[PDB]
Structure formats: structure tokens, C-alpha cells
From a paper:
The final model comprises the tRNA molecule, TbADAT2 residues 19–103, 123–175, and 183–221, and TbADAT3 residues 1–55, 105–263, and 277–340. In our complex structure, the TbtRNAThrCGU is deeply inserted into the active site of TbADAT2 with all seven nucleotides (32–38) of the anticodon loop interacting directly with the ADAT2/3 deaminase core. Here, the sugar-phosphate backbone adopts a bent conformation and the nucleosides U33, C*34, G35 and A37 are splayed outwards. The nucleobase of U36 is unconventionally internalized via a π-π stacking interaction between the nucleobase of C32 and residue Y205 of ADAT2. Furthermore, the reactive nucleobase C*34 conformation is stabilized through hydrophobic interactions with V46TbADAT2 and V133TbADAT2 as well as hydrogen bonding with the conserved asparagine N79TbADAT2, while its ribose moiety is clamped by V44TbADAT2 and F160TbADAT2.
I34 formation is essential for viability and catalyzed by adenosine deaminases acting on tRNA (ADATs). In eukaryotes, the essential enzyme catalyzing I34 formation in tRNA is a heterodimer, composed by one active (ADAT2) and one inactive (ADAT3) paralogous subunits, both homologs of the bacterial enzyme.
Author numbering:
A (entry chain 2): 19 to 103, 123 to 175, 183 to 221
B (entry chain 3): 0 to 55, 105 to 263, 277 to 340
Write the structure that this text describes.
RNA sequence: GGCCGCUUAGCACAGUGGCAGUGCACCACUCUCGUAAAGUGGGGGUCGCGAGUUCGAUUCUCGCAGUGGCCUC
């Protein structure tokens, strides 16, 4: 066996950003699927109920309501995975490339592989700056592929600032037309 | 003893260039426009100033990073109505942006078009004493009581400078990292990949603190932090803004302020912040 | 009283006989982890002030107005 991208998992990941977009949180969604479930046999879209029930943990960018400015999607679902119960060998599929924070946390937990659809230059852990295989020990590392469904991953994120903020200082907020 | 942490850089070198001598001012005033029209400065060669006076007398530089153009020099001679002699000079190939002392260090040969770099404030005399008091009061005593052999020994504190450097929140015993676990120990202690991880660690003693002040994001506070934050706590300090970071004993195995990569200096990131060592 | 320095846009500070500048900013604009950030461009000035010198003075020359350091009372 091995791990390959499965379409329905990324569909769930991207449809897990629209719900957070309606809430008004930044549209970044992560889906932790079972380690031995990303196998080619599950590549097809068949058995949608079974495929979306094999999903182990899902998270969104819960920073707006929480108040913790340091809690992206990756840091939430792992908590959910911890709450439902380990060395996080489960594969993680996210819509935007993990930030340096998430790329460090996943390194510390020995993640088997972390796929992402879009690359965010301002805060990118596997893009501009590379924590994919940076740590040198003595054998601690993970991998990450280029991008899948990037167009949706950027449309949802652009639809965020087109609508304005709410909590903001009257002087510091932007009254864009 | 505060040692400011700055991105290392190499001293500039010199590449050949061609100059000349100018006697009268009006000819040079016309020559400025003539050279601007004929030989505009290259983008890599725009970091210099054409105006120059000889040490002994005015001598003017003409061509940067290479020989003069034949037609351009002939037109310059025609404008001067006299022959133009060329003496070789040298011009810098590396542009400094952080040190005023380094900026002046090569000013003897030639000035820089980019002005004196904005010198960061060199703290103050009393704030050093405040830092010493906080070290002898809070962070260092925790690193004393936090570690028996079992807990790691890292403590971080969110100090507020406006109120006389008072501790807003301090990480305690129930926040630190176990030695046996290897998930938390990759960043701070060496060879943590040898042992398996019993648990999953999501928060280090620098992220527990930053999530207890929400009661914007810690913008404008300060963080005394004993051992130097890892790469995760670097984004803790960069998404949740922080004015200054004071690490005492650096982490060679992995660290976002020291060994691995100086996160605070990364250009694409929004919030650039300063880091001071304090041993 | 004396002596030394200093005055430049809303602000903070360069700079020099011939173009009047640079950081913060009243503001505007562009984007992929709120766009409450960061990059980017525009406008903003009696260079105490007067007299003199110079084809030409913020600069040079003198005086005067102001502040600051030391000294004298
Ligand atoms: Zn992240
Ligand atoms: Zn850390």
C-alpha cells in the first residue's frame, strides 16, 4: 500500500472552507484522513458516504471567534483528533499550504504526509520557506506536493476581503466600495 | 549585556570604472544632463552619486562597472571642447541597508546614493536595568524550579513596557514540556528523533502565554524567553505581533531566531521585529 | 555679561552657491491565513528674518529674533 491524493477528500476540504466563509472566518479548511485510507483503491468517487465517513478529523480557521490569533485550521483538527481519543501519522489535506507554524507542529508530530492545494507566500511553511525537510537530527521529516484545485482555493480566499471586517477601529477599517 | 541579533552580510567589493577630471563648474553642470541623457545609470549602479571632488580639484566619474562608450566620450569631449583623460577607479557591487557604520566604512572611496540607513533605537540605560530585574525576578527562577530531570526547563513571559515592565502573564509548571516525550523536544533539545513520542504536543511555553492575554493580538508587548523560541514559536511571535524578544541561551538544534533560520528578518513576512540576546 | 552651537513640510531630522531632501504621518492605492498588517505613489516648505556679496544665496559675509550647553552675577 501507499498514499495518493483522493479527489473526494479535497472536495471535502474545499467545501469545508465555504462553511467557514459564511461564518466569516478565513477560508482555510483541513481534513485529517486515516493513514491507510488515502490508498489508490479509494481514488474513485464511488461510495461517497463511506469515503466521507472515513474522514477522521476536520478543522477550520477558528481565530476570529476564539480570540487566539495563533490557531489556524491545522492546529484545530489535531486538537479534535486529540479530543476524540498517538503520533499523528494520519495524512493531512489542506486548502492552503501550511504556515511556518503548522509546518513546524506537523514536523514535531512526525506527520507522514501533508498535501496542500494552494501556496500562500506571506505565511508559507512549504512554499517560500521550507520546513518540509529542514530539521537535521543525529531522521525527522515529511513531504508535500505542489497544488490541487488551486483556483477554488484562491477564489474562496479572495471572497473574504471583498466583504469588509466588523470588529475594527473606525479609523483603521477600510470602507471600500 | 545585550547582544543585538542582525542578519549576517558580506562586506562590499569593488569593480572597475572610468572617471575624469573637471575644472570649471558650468561644464560639469551641463555634463550632468549630458550623461543622464547619454549614459543613464544602470539599476544595479544607481546606488552611487556622480558628483565628486578630487582629494588634491574636481574629478568626475563617467562610466560605472565598465569602460566608457566611445561615442559618448567623444560627444562629452565635444561639449567640453577639449580632450578628456581617463583614470581608473572602483565602484561598489554590494549595497548595504542595515549598518550606518558599514555604510560610512566605504564612504572614503565613494559615497552612497542611498542615504544613511535608519538606525534603530539603541534601547535605553534604564530599560537594561528593567530587563535585568525581570530576568532575576521571573524567567530565570522558573528555569530553576521548572526543571528537575523530568521537565525541560523553558519559560517565557509577556512583559508590558508601558507599566514599568510588569509581568502580565508567566508560564508555570503545568505548561512546560516533558523530557520523555519526543514530540515537544525536537525543537529545543538535540537528538529527539531517537525516542518515540508518547503524546501529541501542540503548545510550547511560548504559545501557552500568547493564548492567555486575549482575555489586538498581543501587539506592542515584549517577551523575555530564556531558551530561544523554536520555529513554531517564531510564527507565534509573527502572527501574534511582539515588539522585542530577549532569548538568553540559544537553541543550536532548532530555533527560529538563531540556528535554523532567523524568522524575524524574513522579508515576505508582515511583522519584522528585533531580537536581543541577554546572557 | 561672555562664549560655543543651533533654527529646513503636520511632525522628526539631513543636506549643500545653481534639483530643495529622508523617517513617522494628516491621506490615497495593490495583494493568498482580517486587508487592524506590509509593500507603492502622490501633495505637503517664509529653509529666523533683514542687509550685503555674487550672473545667482537656505548655504557665503554681518547684524538682529529665537532656543540650548557651559561660565560670570
Ligand atoms: Zn497555518
Ligand atoms: Zn516552540
Amino acid at each position: 500500500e501507499s498514499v495518493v491524493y483522493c479527489d473526494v477528500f479535497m472536495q471535502a476540504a474545499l467545501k469545508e472552507a465555504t462553511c467557514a466563509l459564511e461564518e466569516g472566518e478565513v477560508p482555510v479548511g483541513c481534513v485529517l484522513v486515516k493513514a491507510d485510507s488515502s490508498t489508490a483503491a479509494q481514488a474513485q468517487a464511488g461510495d461517497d458516504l463511506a469515503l466521507q465517513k472515513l474522514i477522521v478529523a476536520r478543522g477550520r480557521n477558528a481565530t476570529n471567534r476564539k480570540g487566539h490569533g495563533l490557531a489556524h485550521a491545522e492546529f484545530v483538527a489535531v486538537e479534535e483528533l486529540l479530543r476524540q481519543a498517538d503520533l499523528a501519522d494520519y495524512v493531512l489535506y489542506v486548502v492552503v499550504e501550511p504556515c511556518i507554524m503548522c509546518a513546524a507542529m506537523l514536523l514535531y508530530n512526525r506527520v507522514r504526509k501533508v498535501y496542500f492545494g494552494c501556496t500562500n507566500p506571506r505565511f508559507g511553511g512549504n512554499g517560500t520557506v521550507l520546513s518540509v525537510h529542514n530539521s537535521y537530527k543525529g531522521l525527522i521529516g515529511y513531504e508535500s506536493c505542489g497544488g490541487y484545485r488551486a483556483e477554488e482555493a484562491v477564489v474562496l480566499l479572495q471572497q473574504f476581503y471583498r466583504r469588509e471586517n466588523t470588529n475594527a477601529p473606525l479609523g483603521k477599517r477600510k470602507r471600500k466600495d | 549585556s545585550m547582544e543585538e541579533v542582525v542578519v549576517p552580510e558580506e562586506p562590499p567589493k569593488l569593480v572597475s570604472a572610468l572617471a575624469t577630471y573637471v575644472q570649471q563648474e558650468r561644464l560639469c553642470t551641463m555634463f550632468l544632463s549630458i550623461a543622464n541623457k547619454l549614459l543613464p545609470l544602470k539599476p544595479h549602479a544607481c546606488h552611487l552619486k556622480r558628483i565628486r571632488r578630487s582629494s588634491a580639484v574636481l574629478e568626475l566619474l563617467l562610466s560605472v562597472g565598465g569602460p566608457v562608450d566611445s561615442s559618448a566620450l567623444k560627444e562629452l569631449e565635444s561639449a567640453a571642447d577639449t580632450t578628456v583623460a581617463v583614470h581608473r577607479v572602483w565602484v561598489p557591487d554590494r549595497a548595504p541597508r542595515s549598518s550606518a557604520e558599514e555604510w560610512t566604512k566605504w564612504c572614503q572611496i565613494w559615497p552612497f546614493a542611498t542615504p544613511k540607513p535608519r538606525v534603530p533605537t539603541q534601547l535605553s540605560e534604564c530599560e537594561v536595568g528593567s530587563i535585568q530585574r525581570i530576568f532575576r525576578t521571573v524567567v530565570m527562577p522558573l528555569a530553576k524550579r521548572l526543571r528537575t530531570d523530568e521537565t525541560l526547563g523553558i519559560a517565557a513571559v509577556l512583559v508590558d513596557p508601558s507599566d514599568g515592565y510588569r509581568v502580565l502573564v508567566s508560564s508555570g509548571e503545568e505548561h512546560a514540556l516533558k523530557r520523555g516525550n519526543s514530540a515537544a523536544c525536537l525543537g529545543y533539545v538535540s537528538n529527539s528523533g531517537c525516542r518515540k513520542s508518547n503524546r501529541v504536543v501542540l503548545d510550547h511555553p511560548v504559545t501557552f502565554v500568547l493564548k492567555e492575554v486575549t482575555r489586538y493580538l498581543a501587539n506592542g508587548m515584549d517577551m523575555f524567553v530564556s531558551h530561544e523560541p523554536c520555529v513554531m514559536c517564531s510564527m507565534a511571535l509573527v502572527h501574534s505581533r511582539v515588539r522585542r524578544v530577549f532569548y538568553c541561551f540559544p537553541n543550536p538544534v532548532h530555533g527560529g531566531l538563531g540556528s535554523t533560520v532567523s524568522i524575524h528578518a524574513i522579508q515576505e513576512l508582515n511583522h519584522h521585529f528585533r531580537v536581543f540576546r541577554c546572557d
